UniProtKB/Swiss-Prot annotation, chains A, B, C:
GO process terms (BP): DNA repair
Broad enzyme group: transferase
Organism: Mycolicibacterium smegmatis (strain ATCC 700084 / mc(2)155)
InterPro entries: DisA, DisA/LigA_HHH, DisA_sf, DNA_integrity_DisA_N_sf, DNA_integrity_scan_DisA_link, DNA_integrity_scan_DisA_N, DNA_integrity_scanning_protein, RuvA_2-like
Outcome reported for the amino acid change (mutating D66A): Loss of enzymatic activity
Entry keywords, A to Z: ATP-binding, DNA damage, DNA repair, DNA-binding, Magnesium, Manganese, Nucleotide-binding, Nucleotidyltransferase, Transferase
Regulation: Diadenylate cyclase activity is inhibited by the interaction with RadA.
Domain DAC residue range list: 1-138
Cofactor(s) this protein cannot do without: Mg(2+)
EC number: 2.7.7.85
Catalysed conversion reaction: 2 ATP = 3',3'-c-di-AMP + 2 diphosphate
Binding-site residues for ATP, renumbered to this chain: G67, L85, T98, R99, H100, R101, S102
UniProt protein name: DNA integrity scanning protein DisA
Length: 346, 346, 346
C-alpha cells in the first residue's frame, strides 16, 4: 500500500481506524503491523497463531495482552499476536523509545504499514516510506483545510476574471506572450492547490465529508481547461495530439514554482521564441477554447472542425453553410454552431 | 428508543448525566440498563430489588455493587441492582469482553440503552438499536461544532448573495433555470448543515448553550423560505397546495448529494423538461418570495392575491385600485402593498 | 478430579501455582479452567484457539482478556482464550459476582478445576468438586500446622506412656482388656490426626518443606504398629489373615470420634462380648507385639511361629531345642530369638 493508501485505510470509518480508536480510548499501547511475508515472520517471535476473521475488538484485546499484533496484508485475518518485532541494530533510527525504535526499524527493513500507538498519550504513528507520520486529530486537519480553501477560492476568482478578459480580447484577438501565459501560470497554480487539498481530503477520509463538496462545487473544470488551452494554444507546425498534450502536462507539472513564474520557461515548454522581444508575438486561436463552449458537442467534432479550419479567426469569418460543407456535417446542425458563435462575439 | 433521543437523555444537565458524572468521578464501572420489562426480567438474575426514587447519589452508590443497575424505562426509578445479566448466547456479537459482550447481547435482545462505563476508565458506551457510540466529552463536540459552523456561515453568505441576485432579477423579470436552482441548491445544503449541527446541539444538551444561539442566529428563516420557494417555483397549471408542497419537501429530503449537485434532477423533482434547452428556458416567478418582504402581511391574503394575479409581473404592473378590486382587499390594504412594490421598483 | 490432587497441583512449586502467583503480582484478574469435553465446548462461546504447550507466562498474559482461559484435563495444553464461559442460568449459585458465579456454575457442570482470581486483591479461589475453597497464604496454613503439631506431640507422649505400660504388662503375665485396648484407641486417634495434618502437608506442597519430615519423625511406624497389634490381639479361634486384618483396619477407620472414644464400641467392632466384665478379662496374645522388637526379623517367620504356637505363653515357655524343631527355622537363628526374650525379662 502507498503512503496515501495506508492513510486512506487509516481514515476514520474504516475498520482499522476503528480498532485504532478503540485502542486509543482504552488508554493502552498497541503495535499493529500489516502484511505477511517471510521477513515479517523471520523477525517476529514470541506469540501465538489464531486465523480468525478481523474485527474491531480482536486487535484491541491482543494489544491489551501487551504485545505486537500482526495482520494480513489486506488487514482481514489475524494469525499472530504478542510478537516482539526485533529488526537488526544496524538500521539507524533517531527515535528514543524501544517500542517506536522497533516500529521504525521494522518499517525500514520491511516497507509495510506498522502502527505504533504510545500509551499515556493519544498519538497514532506510522513509519512508512522512510518517514514517520503522526496521525493528527481532525481539528488541525479541518483548520488547515479551511485556511487553504480561502486561498484556493481567491485563486478561482483570479482565474475566472483573467480568463474572461483573455477571451474577450481574443474575440478581437491581438496576442502578447505575457497575456497568453499568465492564464497558464494561474491555471497551474490552481491545479497545484487542488492537488494539495486532495491530499488533505485523502488523509481526512470521512469526518470531513464536506471538502469534497467544496472542491466539486468550486474547481469544476480544471483538467479539461488545461487540455483545452494546450490544444488550442501550442505553437508547433503539427497539430498537437493527445500524447503531446499529456507530455506537455507532465512537463508543466515537472516545473517548479520558481520555474512556473518565469514566462521564458513556460514558453519553451509550449515552444515559443524565448527572446524578450517575443513578448508581443501574436498567433491565431486554433479553435478549441472559444468554440468549446457549445453545449451538446462532442470532442471528435471539435477535432474535425479544427482540421477543416485550423484557426478561429477564419471561423469568425466563416459563412453559415461552409460549416455544413465540412465532411459529416448537416445544414441544421451547422446552423446551431454559427448562431452560437455569432453570439460569442459580444 | 431512538439513538438520538437517548443521546439527549444523556446530555449534560439531565439527572442521568449527573449520576453518570458522579460514577465517573468514583473511578468505578457501571452497567446501567435504562428500562425494565419482560425481556430484562427474563434476562436478569441474582440481585436485589429496590424500587426507590432515582437520585444521582443513589445510582452512584448502587453502581459500586459490582453488578448491573436496571433503572425504569423513563429513568425515574432504580428497581434492580447487582443483577447478573445472562444474555442469550445464540446472538452473534463481536464485542469481545464479557461486560461488553453481555451489554451488546442484551441490547440486541431488547433495544433498551445499555450504558457500559468501563472500570476505572472514563468511557461511556451506548447500546441502542444495534449501534455502538462512545459518548464523547463536550470539548470534542464543541470543537467539531465550531468547525462546522464556519461552513454553515459560508453557505449562508453564498445563499444570501444568490438570493439577492434572484430578487434583483425578479424585480425586472428575466429568469433562467440556473438562476432559480442556484437558490434551491444552496437552500437544501444549508438545511443539511442545519440538521447536522442540530444533532451535535441536542447531544450537548445544556453544556453548549451558545451553539443553539449561533445556529438560530445564522440559519434564520430557512423553512419558511423553502416553503415559499416551493410554492412559487413549480411547473404546473396552479402552484401546489399545502399537502403537495409538504410532499415535495419530503421528496427533496429524500434526495442525496449526488442528485443535489445536478440541476436537471432538481428541476425534474419539481417537474421540468430535462433538456439543456430547458436549462436555458425562462419562467416568471409567482411572486411569493419577492413580495413576501411586506411586513405583517397575511399568508392567506398573499396566496389569494397571487391566485388572482398568477405572477409577480402582474403585481408590479397592478394599478392603485387593481389590488383593491381583488376580493378581500380594501382601500388601506391596497396601497399598503403597492408602497413596497413602488419602493422595490428601484 | 479430587481435592487432594488438584490442591497438590495448585500447591507452590507446581507450574499452575507459579502462574497464579505471577497473575497475583500483576494485580489483574484471571479465569483458568482445566478440562475440555462436550459440555465445556457447549458452554464456550466467543473465544480463541492456540494449541501451544504450557508455560508460566501464557496464563499471565491471557488473563487480561476479561473472558476465561480453558486448558485440557491434564492441565498442560493451552487450547482456548478469552471465552465467556456461560453455563445454564438455572443452576443455583448464591455467589454474588459475575466472574465467580460463572466459575461456580461451570465447575458444577464440568467438575474440572475452575480457578477464579479477583483483581485488585490477592485472593485465589478453587471451585473443585462443587465446593469453593479460598487458597490461603502459606502463613495461615503454617500457623494452623504449628498449633496442630503441639497436639500431635502430646498425643504421641500419651501413647508412648500407655504403650510402655502395656509392654511392662507384656513382660509379665498380667493382661487386661482395657490396657490392651486403650493403646489401640490412642494409636488410631494419633493416626487420624496424622492424616489430618498430612492433608495440610500436601496442600503446602513445597512451602512447608519441613512438616513432612516432622511427621515422619513423630509418627514413626504407625501402620506397622497397627498391623502387628491387630494380628497379635485377635480374640478368635484362628489367627487373622492379611485380607481380614486389612478389612478390620478400615472397619476401625470407619469409626468416628464419638464411637471411637468409647471403649466398649472399639471392643465390639473388632468382635468381643459387650459385657462390662469382659473389660477385666484376659485374652491370649499371639506375641507379635511382644517379640516384634527383635531386629533383622522376618514377618513370615514370626507368623509361622505363631501358627505353630498360638499363644505368647508358648514363647515365654519356649525351650532351646523346640524352636529349632520348628520347620523352616535353624539353630543359629534360634538363639537369636531367645536372647531377645531373655534380655527383655529384666
Amino acid at each position: 500500500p502507498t503512503l496515501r493508501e495506508t492513510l486512506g485505510r487509516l481514515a476514520p470509518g474504516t475498520p482499522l481506524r476503528d480498532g485504532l480508536e478503540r485502542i486509543l480510548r482504552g488508554r493502552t499501547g498497541a503495535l499493529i503491523v500489516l502484511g505477511y511475508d517471510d521477513s515479517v515472520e523471520a523477525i517476529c517471535d514470541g506469540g501465538f497463531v489464531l486465523d480468525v476473521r478481523y474485527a474491531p475488538t480482536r486487535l484491541r484485546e491482543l494489544s491489551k495482552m501487551d504485545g505486537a499484533v500482526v495482520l494480513s496484508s489486506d488487514g482481514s485475518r489475524i494469525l499472530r499476536a504478542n510478537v516482539q518485532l526485533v529488526p537488526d541494530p544496524s538500521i539507524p533510527t533517531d527515535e528514543s523509545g524501544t517500542r517506536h525504535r522497533s516500529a521504525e526499524r521494522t518499517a525500514i527493513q520491511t516497507g509495510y504499514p506498522v502502527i505504533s500507538v504510545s500509551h499515556s498519550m493519544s498519538i497514532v504513528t506510522v513509519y512508512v516510506a522512510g518517514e514517520r507520520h503522526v496521525v493528527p486529530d481532525s481539528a488541525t486537519i479541518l483548520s488547515r483545510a479551511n485556511q487553504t480553501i480561502a486561498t484556493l477560492e481567491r485563486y478561482k476568482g483570479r482565474l475566472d476574471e483573467v480568463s474572461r478578459q483573455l477571451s474577450t480580447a481574443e474575440i478581437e484577438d491581438f496576442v502578447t506572450l505575457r497575456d497568453v501565459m499568465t492564464v497558464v501560470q494561474r491555471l497551474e497554480m490552481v491545479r497545484r492547490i487542488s492537488l494539495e487539498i486532495d491530499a488533505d481530503v485523502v488523509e481526512l477520509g470521512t469526518d470531513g465529508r464536506q471538502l469534497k463538496l467544496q472542491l466539486d462545487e468550486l474547481v469544476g473544470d480544471n483538467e479539461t481547461a488545461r487540455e483545452l488551452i494546450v490544444r488550442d494554444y501550442h505553437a508547433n507546425p503539427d497539430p498537437p495530439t493527445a500524447a503531446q498534450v499529456a507530455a506537455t502536462l507532465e512537463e508543466l507539472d515537472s516545473l517548479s514554482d520558481s520555474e512556473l513564474l518565469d514566462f521564458t520557461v513556460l514558453a519553451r515548454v509550449f515552444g515559443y521564441p524565448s527572446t524578450a522581444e517575443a513578448q508581443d508575438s501574436a498567433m491565431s486561436s486554433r479553435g478549441y477554447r472559444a468554440m468549446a463552449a457549445i453545449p451538446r458537442l462532442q470532442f471528435a467534432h471539435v477535432d474535425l472542425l479544427v482540421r477543416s479550419f485550423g484557426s478561429l479567426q477564419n471561423l469568425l469569418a466563416a459563412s453559415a453553410d461552409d460549416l455544413q460543407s465540412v465532411d459529416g456535417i448537416g445544414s441544421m446542425w451547422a446552423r446551431h454552431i454559427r448562431e452560437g458563435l455569432s453570439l460569442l462575439a459580444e
